Design a protein around this ligand. Structure first.
Ligand SMILES: COC(=O)c1ccc(P(=O)(O)OCCOCc2ccccc2)cc1
Ligand SMILES: [Ca+2]
Ligand SMILES: [Ca+2]
Ligand SMILES: [Cl-]
Length: 259
């Protein structure tokens, strides 16, 4: 009965697939837009099952949306509006990246053209980001507690305490990261999140700081599952999140399961 359920019942094969059951169309947003550097909107074409939630996606320091473009088709085809953004400058700090993620979401709600706006549920928004943009994902949830989900990917931030976060948060770390080492960024972040929050931490064996910038089935399958569970309230995806996954590519996993 869940009004936000989209797509057939999932399997291990369907969440690993490079293409979900929805066909995807795109829209380029100029950098002239206020509040962020523009980006690319990826949306599902089919409307017979209802509107969709959205996730804004930020890159890291010195990087552009091209470092995140593969999340666009992969995630949107499982039933989401996906907005891979550019920041105002490639040198913006994490707090700036959080502010601009929220401006990108507000663009979708308030400014987008009819093709996008009529496919969107403005009540169900989420944030995701890489490196400093993962620090921005944390920042955005403090700025806006009504967000449905947050996914910081190999996140970087000098602030190590996130005990006021109220948004379900999934931190992905890279075991051999030397730029944002898991021992000094991802793990203290995760441990400082409220213990009553639905949250998870996944550490990828042998991975580096730029693992999130190339197609990665392990990232994709649980990014999709997390957005499904919390943006769509879709408990069909709880089976992949709880108990903790044991994929060979995972070297540590922590969670507040069951949820
Ligand atoms: C300001 O403090 C820092 O130097 C610094 C702190 C954090 C991060 P990041 O968002 O986790 O990195 C993501 C992109 O790789 C960085 C990079 C790429 C290419 C050439 C040099 C550096 C980056 C830099
Ligand atoms: Ca702009
Ligand atoms: Ca464990
Ligand atoms: Cl690295």
């Amino acid at each position: 009965p869940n009004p936000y359920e989209r797509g057939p019942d999932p399997t291990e094969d369907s969440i690993e697939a490079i293409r979900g059951p929805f066909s995807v169309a795109t829209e380029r947003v100029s950098s002239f837009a206020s509040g962020f550097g523009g980006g690319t909107i990826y949306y599902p074409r089919e409307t017979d099952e209802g509107t969709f939630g959205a996730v804004a996606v930020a890159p890291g320091f010195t990087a552009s949306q091209g470092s995140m473009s593969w999340y666009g088709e992969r995630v949107a085809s499982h039933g989401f509006i996906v907005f891979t953004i550019d920041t105002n400058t490639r040198l913006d700090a994490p707090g700036q990246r959080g502010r601009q993620l929220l401006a990108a979401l507000d663009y979708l709600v308030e400014r987008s053209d009819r093709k996008v706006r009529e496919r969107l549920d403005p009540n169900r928004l989420a944030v995701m980001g890489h490196a400093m943009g993962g620090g921005g994902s944390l920042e955005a949830t403090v700025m806006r507690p009504s967000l449905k989900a947050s996914i910081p990917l190999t996140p970087w931030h000098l602030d190590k305490t996130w005990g006021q976060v109220q948004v379900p948060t999934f931190i992905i770390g890279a075991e051999l990261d030397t730029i944002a080492p898991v021992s000094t960024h991802a793990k203290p972040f995760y441990e400082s999140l409220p213990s009553s929050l639905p949250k998870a931490y996944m550490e990828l064996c042998g991975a580096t700081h730029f693992a999130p910038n190339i197609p990665n089935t392990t990232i994709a399958k649980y990014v999709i599952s997390w957005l499904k569970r919390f943006v769509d309230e879709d408990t069909r995806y709880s089976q992949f999140l709880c108990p903790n996954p044991t994929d060979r590519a995972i070297c540590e996993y922590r969670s507040t399961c069951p949820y």
